[PDB]
Amino acid sequence: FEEKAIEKVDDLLESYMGIRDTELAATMVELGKDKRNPDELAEALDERLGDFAFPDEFVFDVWGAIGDAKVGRY
Amino acid sequence: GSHDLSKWKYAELRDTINTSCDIELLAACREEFHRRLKVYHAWKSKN
């Protein structure tokens, strides 16, 4: 699960910020893996990584991406 | 500009930077592009 999730997310990082970080991306996978909707994910991202000002579409794609990992969509 | 430039993708920013001739939009994108790296700097040095 988690390894493929981090990739999908880290790619979403690069496409947002221009940089890449398998750690920061993994923080986010871990944060929202066990949530129930993109808002719960958003609330947790806001806790630590608040200053990024991550847009809704980003928080959607990460919700989407992590979802795809539990399914096997890779 | 009175754009919400936090919605933009990194591609988006870099592209309008070396395409647009709108000086206001330019400085605005150049600033956003900066912000995100500045914020990433602050996160890196802590963890």
Residue numbers in the entry:
A (entry chain A): 260 to 333
B (entry chain B): 1050 to 1096
Sentences from the paper on this structure:
We determined the crystal structures of the myosin VI-HCBD in complex with the GH2 domain from GIPC1 and GIPC2, respectively. There are five copies of both myosin VI-HCBD and GIPC1-GH2 molecules in each asymmetric unit, arranged in an alternating pattern. The group of five HCBD and GH2 domains repeats itself in the neighboring unit cell, yielding a continuous array of alternating HCBD and GH2 that extends throughout the crystal. Considering one GH2/HCBD pair as a unit, the neighboring units in the array are related roughly by a five-fold right-handed rotational symmetry and a ~22 Å translation. The bivalent interactions between the GIPC-GH2 and myosin VI-HCBD are mediated by two distinct interfaces. Interface I involves the two loops in the GIPC-GH2 domain, one between helices α1 and α2 and the other between helices α3 and α4. These two loops interact with Arg1084 and Arg1085 in the ‘RRL’ motif on one side of the second helix in the myosin VI-HCBD. In addition, hydrophobic residues such as Val1088, Tyr1089 and Trp1092 on the same side of the second helix in the myosin VI-HCBD dock on the hydrophobic patch formed by Tyr275, Met276, Ile278, Leu283, Phe311, etc. in the GIPC1-GH2 domain. Interface II is formed on the opposite side of the HCBD with helix α4 and the N-terminal end of helix α3 in the GIPC1-GH2 domain. Interfaces I and II bury ~1300 and ~1100 Å2 solvent accessible surface area, respectively.
